[PDB]
Symmetry: D2
Subunit: 328 residues, 4 copies
Amino acid sequence: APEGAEYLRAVLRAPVYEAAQVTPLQKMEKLSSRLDNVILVKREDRQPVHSFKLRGAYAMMAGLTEEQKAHGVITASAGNHAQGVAFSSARLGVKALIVMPTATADIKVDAVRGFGGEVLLHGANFDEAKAKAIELSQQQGFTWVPPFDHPTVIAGQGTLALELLQQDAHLDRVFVPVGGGGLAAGVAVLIKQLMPQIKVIAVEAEDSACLKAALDAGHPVDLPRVGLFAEGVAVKRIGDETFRLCQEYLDDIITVDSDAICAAVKDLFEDVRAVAEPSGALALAGMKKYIAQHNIRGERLAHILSGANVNFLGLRYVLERCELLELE
Amino acid sequence: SGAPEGAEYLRAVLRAPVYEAAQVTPLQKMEKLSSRLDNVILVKREDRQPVHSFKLRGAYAMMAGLTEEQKAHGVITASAGNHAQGVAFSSARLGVKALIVMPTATADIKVDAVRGFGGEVLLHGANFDEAKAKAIELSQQQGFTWVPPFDHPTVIAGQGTLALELLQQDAHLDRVFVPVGGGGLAAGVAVLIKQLMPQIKVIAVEAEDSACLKAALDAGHPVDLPRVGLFAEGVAVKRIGDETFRLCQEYLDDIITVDSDAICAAVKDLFEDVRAVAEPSGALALAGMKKYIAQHNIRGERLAHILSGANVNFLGLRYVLERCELLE
Amino acid sequence: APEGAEYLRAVLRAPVYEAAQVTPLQKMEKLSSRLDNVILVKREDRQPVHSFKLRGAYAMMAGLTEEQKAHGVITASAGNHAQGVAFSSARLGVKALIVMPTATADIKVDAVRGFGGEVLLHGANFDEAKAKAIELSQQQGFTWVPPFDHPTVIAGQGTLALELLQQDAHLDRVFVPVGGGGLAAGVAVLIKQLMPQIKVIAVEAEDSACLKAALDAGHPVDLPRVGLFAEGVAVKRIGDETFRLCQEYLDDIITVDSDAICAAVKDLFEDVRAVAEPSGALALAGMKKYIAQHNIRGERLAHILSGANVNFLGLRYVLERCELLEL
Amino acid sequence: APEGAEYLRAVLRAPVYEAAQVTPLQKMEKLSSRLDNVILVKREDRQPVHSFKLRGAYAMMAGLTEEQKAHGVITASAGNHAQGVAFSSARLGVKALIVMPTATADIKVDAVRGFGGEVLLHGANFDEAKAKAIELSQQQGFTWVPPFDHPTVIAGQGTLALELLQQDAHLDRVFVPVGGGGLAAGVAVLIKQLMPQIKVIAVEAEDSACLKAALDAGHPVDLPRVGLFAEGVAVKRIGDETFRLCQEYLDDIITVDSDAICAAVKDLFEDVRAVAEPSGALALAGMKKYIAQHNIRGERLAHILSGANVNFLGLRYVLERCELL
């Protein structure tokens, strides 16, 4: 449980650039002209695993002891965290086992194996895959790699915000997607240590708003049901350490429905020619709603395209909603 | 430079200054498709060009070859898509005025793409034919040099640089599959390869409802098609070019046609193997190759196709995805 | 006189990456095994102008007022600062006049002109060139671009240190060449705000040690004579604001002679295939002498290759001294 | 003894881009203004081993059978060829032994070891190291990787000329340095198959003109003494196949003295900021002499910076000659 000062030094020490790279901060030209603001996208889809999660996973796994590395790492994931851990394991020479639910698509399982990870199909949902991963952790001595709730993982995602401040120090507000809150905690703790004038706003899907629920209650709480449309942010309970940072450093939170998310997927395809996954377009959808609700004009605003690992046939849903939005 | 022989085309391909605007594009193995089809299946990534289609090669070679008088008088063409984007980019890079005529009903995103590349756009006509008629009239009135989309020896040599790159990126290639609209790309690839590695088979691929080259090969000369399908916009060509048909009839090894559903399946294959979203004409050649592999029971070979373009309407993707879902 | 926190925010705000770029931090293999330390070199020669000075020049010039750019900028420089101001003016669309001594090599003034700067040849030495530059500045109203003594110039150079910390946070010590003191002040203030456990060592040539003289006296002092071998560090008086920061944040200082500098040129050519100018190999020379004097083993030590704009014929002196060392 | 058409197909089939890269063709701005020609330099010093030799070595080594690769490769070289063979062996996963004279400088032995080659120091000169290389080849079954006299080596270097034609098709003349003639043969045969109107001119140091000697006699002869200043072109006898191709396809040959080479080293340092070794500046020197001898103006002229693996202390002699000029 470090203070902001220690987090800043951990962000600097995190060796993310042995696996991840500095990603472009690109102006969205069509959307900037339309919304009377300078809107910039942090293109985390350009990482080797096509999401940001490589940063925190590699940071945590490089920081393990020689003993822990020799016994390998385990985790449970539906996709993006699995590719982060598989890729980091190949680079570090460490055995990695990823438990995924039995219903996981072959393309996702293949991607994890292609990056050098061992895959175990187990469980009817993510909760049963995580139970198997923790059980196997204690039984066979694998080290558990948490997808968000860990200071070294938060520091790793914080490298993203450090790049932002050097790529554009005149930023006014940064919009961050939230699942368990690893990324939001890293961005918010880093920015509040270096350039606290910049507003950090968390964005959540309406049917997956576990941080909003935790903020309302004043502590982490379980959601009764989590929507599955945005896979990456389908988290039932915000993390303990991530909530501590988010409750302390976030300036605001906003929620958006499936329609806004799909509109943002279309916006990013037309402005930067990338197909974001729904959780990758989430922060943009929040920013667009924030801009209208608060009548924001003349500012420099950034959102994180956090991932672009999309199911091809799953794009039918996104495109159908976009067609339905045209009819109105 | 009116009806050149093979040796004169070869030297023309070396002389085309395409690398002042275009770039050498990757030749990638499609891993999933290669393991599934028992061949090494490679894709030439022409979507990686600055205008996201190969048409920059022919347009820039032809426009850079014009006299100092013609350049000072500017160029003109009629197009709503890739050819217009290639002419606009070339004119910006050569510092030459370019006017592009499009039908008044053309979508804003198409018009703005050509404008963003540096081309003046004149909206005129109720269809492509009237847009072309205006452009030819303005060519006679105001002295613009018309830039043909395929039927020109310098345009053909410009596209031929694609095949010269292929021979250096993989000289162990067995067969190359090429989409055909008016025949410019196929003529350049065929004449180049038959001058340097004649043992490589070059096979043209056409949409069933847009096969003006199969019609011209059946008749022995260029003929007009009654109706042309519009699904694959890039290859919606009513009549093959005179010079391209001369080279295609002389140097092609085979031709094949595929229906809309085969194209849609190819779009899905390219999104899952190389993470690109091809437009229908850009997946045409892969559709052609997959039918050819099955009809001829081909195994253990090295086969290449050209992803010729990736300028896609986002909302147009829902038909492609609907057909893919019906395909299982 | 900003505080450490203000310098940190100034470093982050410095728009240096509109002109300069992030330079490699390379390991020197041959030297590392020989001296039993991991020795890293920051390759500032890889900047478009082939010295670090682009960072501070562009930051200061981008930060003027629209009125100041309309009137233009002036500076006096013998080489590397001139190419930084020339390049920054072309990128910013600003008029730049550079006063250089009449004896400046044609290759140096052509490089400044090639980068898009007006050159005025005047003066028997750098002093008379600076005097004419300040004179034209008061008369015609050109904004003077200081080579080192300016918070925004210092903040610009500080971006080098911020890169170092993200490229290797397990560094033990960083060795910095010192002329006027802007780079050493940027590097030292930045690192002491973020990773104060890291040691920052200034390195000066013996016949140009105006920071050593200033530290001995407790204030900036004038040097009677300054050696001209290492052109970039041939400064007679340390800057006021750079001295304040250097006195406050530096961990140590060391001086070296012409033989050490020439030996460090040979080292850099054989390990990383670069021809450093004498000022660019200076920090390495200090590092080697520091390692021996303090018996340093098993540490991670970085120096800055600050520039590689060498007069070809001027290399005879360096090669001559290296042959004498070989004998 | 393949024909021109066969070499062309060899150049296309050479898999050089698995180890080597397409190098820049750069205009020399200062020298182009001074000499009233567009003077372009092909920067083969930017190859991973800092010489063109990685092209020929990788193409030959990749063309070996699986059994040959399993038995390993051997060569004799104290400089650039050693680094090319070493680097190719690391990319192909093949064992390589390199025999070098016992007096070879440490930095040269370490550069070959760093690229992944086994070094055996043996012999009082190059001839004694080569004899040990062939001996170890005949006993243990190492495949001998020739530095120049081999059709696949020649076709590997010829990729350099195929790049040149696509980088600038309005080239008038190309100048190539010659040691054993593998580079010149590959460049000359490639260009004469595709754009024969382009002149190819061999350049040789006077102290090492084994190709001019072979052309005078009409067949490969032995040079009595060879100059060692330009190490990479210090070859006693032109190859058999490289001479056959050079004699048929070159347009001209020109020699230069040491001072011309030194002046060219200074020109390249001031125009492109590289320190060429003497063999790498040889082509430029020949081109400057050619330009004056034939009053060439307003043309597009290319030379090959063939290598920049230089001895630092050796620069003292070059610098002294440049000050005297």
